[PDB]
Amino acid sequence: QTSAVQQKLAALEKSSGGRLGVALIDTADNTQVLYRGDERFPMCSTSKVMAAAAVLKQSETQKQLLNQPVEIKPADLVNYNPIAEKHVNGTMTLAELSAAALQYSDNTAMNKLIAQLGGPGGVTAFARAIGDETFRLDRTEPTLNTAIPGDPRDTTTPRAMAQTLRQLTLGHALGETQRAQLVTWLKGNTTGAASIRAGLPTSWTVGDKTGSGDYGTTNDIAVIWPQGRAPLVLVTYFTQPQQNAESRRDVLASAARIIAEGL
Numbered sequence: 001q002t003s004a005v006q007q008k009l010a011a012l013e014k015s016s017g018g019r020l021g022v023a024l025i026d027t028a029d030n031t032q033v034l035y036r037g038d039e040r041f042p043m044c045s046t047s048k049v050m051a052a053a054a055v056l057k058q059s060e061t062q063k064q065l066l067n068q069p070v071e072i073k074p075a076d077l078v079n080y081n082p083i084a085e086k087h088v089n090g091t092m093t094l095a096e097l098s099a100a101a102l103q104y105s106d107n108t109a110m111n112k113l114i115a116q117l118g119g120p121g122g123v124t125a126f127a128r129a130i131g132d133e134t135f136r137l138d139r140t141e142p143t144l145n146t147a148i149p150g151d152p153r154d155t156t157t158p159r160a161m162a163q164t165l166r167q168l169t170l171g172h173a174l175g176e177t178q179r180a181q182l183v184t185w186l187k188g189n190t191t192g193a194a195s196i197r198a199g200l201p202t203s204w205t206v207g208d209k210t211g212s213g214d215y216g217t218t219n220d221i222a223v224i225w226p227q228g229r230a231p232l233v234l235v236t237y238f239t240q241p242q243q244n245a246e247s248r249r250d251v252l253a254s255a256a257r258i259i260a261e262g263l
């Protein structure tokens with residue numbers, strides 16, 4: 001069937017010219033709302049949640065892991081690294097790298113998380129360990145953001161990413177202190193106010209991770225604590241036909257607004 005919410009998302013998509021993917025989980029009743037929920041989309045910087053969570057999982061058996069220093073060298077800088085560039089010829093701890101990757105979307109920091117996991121496949125392996133058979137990370141930063149239509153590399157589906165985000169932030173994929181740390185990091189994101197958050201009532205609390213890439217790819221994954229009800233998990237992924245298309249965070253906000261109006 002096609003629900004009223006799905007019809008509205010289709011109308012939004014038609015006006016956008018691009019391809020929109022949405023997955024909601026309402027933890028009040030475990031129900032789901034999906035739009036292109038099983039189609040693949042390039043994750044771009046939203047993949048940083050999986051990498052940070054995988055390091056948090058490692059830290060469950062190493063009390064000092066998050067304080068371990070990692071050297072930052074001039075050659076490690078990539079296309080966007082506002083935190084790491086302040087530490088060139090020095091070090092950042094794994095906690096500092098996780099916070100920078102999640103809250104400032106520092107791509108050098110993400111590369112250090114990937115390296116701590118043994119490469120992109122270490123991120124995929126963690127996804128599999130927590131029940132996500134769909135996620136794949138194949139490349140490092142910045143090439144994981146090429147976002148080429150039809151390319152399976154560095155993609156997931158909205159359904160899989162919503163389920164994973166639920167298990168990481170509200171479920172038991174991580175230990176309790178690690179889950180709380182991930183939630184704290186997401187709630188302190190600096191980059192999200194134009195995306196899912198912009199479509200929701202002010203009173204609702206959001207923790208999220210955005211992403212963007214070529215093909216006008218514009219993404220956000222969020223945990224939401226609405227006024228007066230149990231938390232929601234919402235993924236909104238968007239990608240466009242031409243390589244140099246402009247970002248469309250407003251489309252993500254519009255998708256979130258439709259979802260909220262449909263509860």
Ligand SMILES: *C(=O)N1C[C@H](NOS(=O)(=O)O)CC[C@H]1C(N)=O
Nearest residue numbers: 044045105145191210211212213
């Ligand atoms: C993540 O998708 N990237 C790193 C950085 N993310 O900032 S955003 O989440 O606010 O878009 C810039 C865009 C992107 C990249 N292409 O490196």
Ligand SMILES: [K+]
Nearest residue numbers: 082083085086
């Ligand atoms: K800087």
Ligand SMILES: [K+]
Nearest residue numbers: 103104190191
């Ligand atoms: K920022």
Ligand SMILES: [K+]
Nearest residue numbers: 122123125126
């Ligand atoms: K792993």
Ligand SMILES: [K+]
Nearest residue numbers: 130131132163
């Ligand atoms: K699963």
Ligand SMILES: [K+]
Nearest residue numbers: 099103188189
């Ligand atoms: K902060």
Ligand SMILES: [K+]
Nearest residue numbers: 197204205206
């Ligand atoms: K908010």
Ligand SMILES: [K+]
Nearest residue numbers: 149241242243
């Ligand atoms: K094209």
Ligand code: NA
Nearest residue numbers: 082083104190
């Ligand atoms: Na900054």
Ligand code: NA
Nearest residue numbers: 080082104191
């Ligand atoms: Na900036």
Ligand code: NA
Nearest residue numbers: 213214216217
């Ligand atoms: Na872009």
